[PDB]
């Protein structure tokens, strides 16, 4: 379970976990311990998202997709988008 060297975990005001990287002076939602193998989005399967991505079903705005690596949000499922565009 332990973090890499010069990493701390912390809680937001709400008690949400995030990670502090003192090596690069940055914070992230992504757990460095859980760093999965990445893959081209078009190589994912059904209901599969690539590493870094999170599907948000927002009661106000509806479903959208969050990429924690690029710090981007978008509406299209990124796997379906890559598959679409590769046609």
């Amino acid at each position: 379970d332990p973090l890499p060297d010069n990493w701390e975990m912390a809680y937001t005001e709400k008690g949400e976990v995030y990670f502090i990287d003192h090596n690069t002076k940055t914070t992230s939602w992504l757990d460095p311990r859980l760093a999965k193998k990445a893959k081209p989005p078009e190589e994912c399967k059904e209901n599969e998202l690539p590493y870094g991505w999170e599907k948000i079903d927002d009661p106000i705005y509806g479903t959208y997709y969050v990429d924690h690596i690029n710090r981007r949000t978008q509406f299209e499922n990124p796997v379906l988008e890559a598959k679409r565009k590769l046609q």
């Binding site: 701390e8 975990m9 912390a10 809680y11 937001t12 005001e13 995030y18 990670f19 502090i20 990287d21 002076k25 940055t26 914070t27 992230s28 939602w29 948000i56 927002d58 705005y61 959208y64 997709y65 969050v66 710090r71 981007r72 949000t73 978008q74 509406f75």
Partner: peptide
């Protein structure tokens, strides 16, 4: 439209609840 903007964790340069 654009979806909701990316919500980052608290910025590094500041106080953190390091209570782990």
């Amino acid at each position: 439209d654009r979806p909701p903007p990316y919500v980052a964790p608290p910025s590094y340069e500041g106080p953190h609840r390091t209570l782990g």
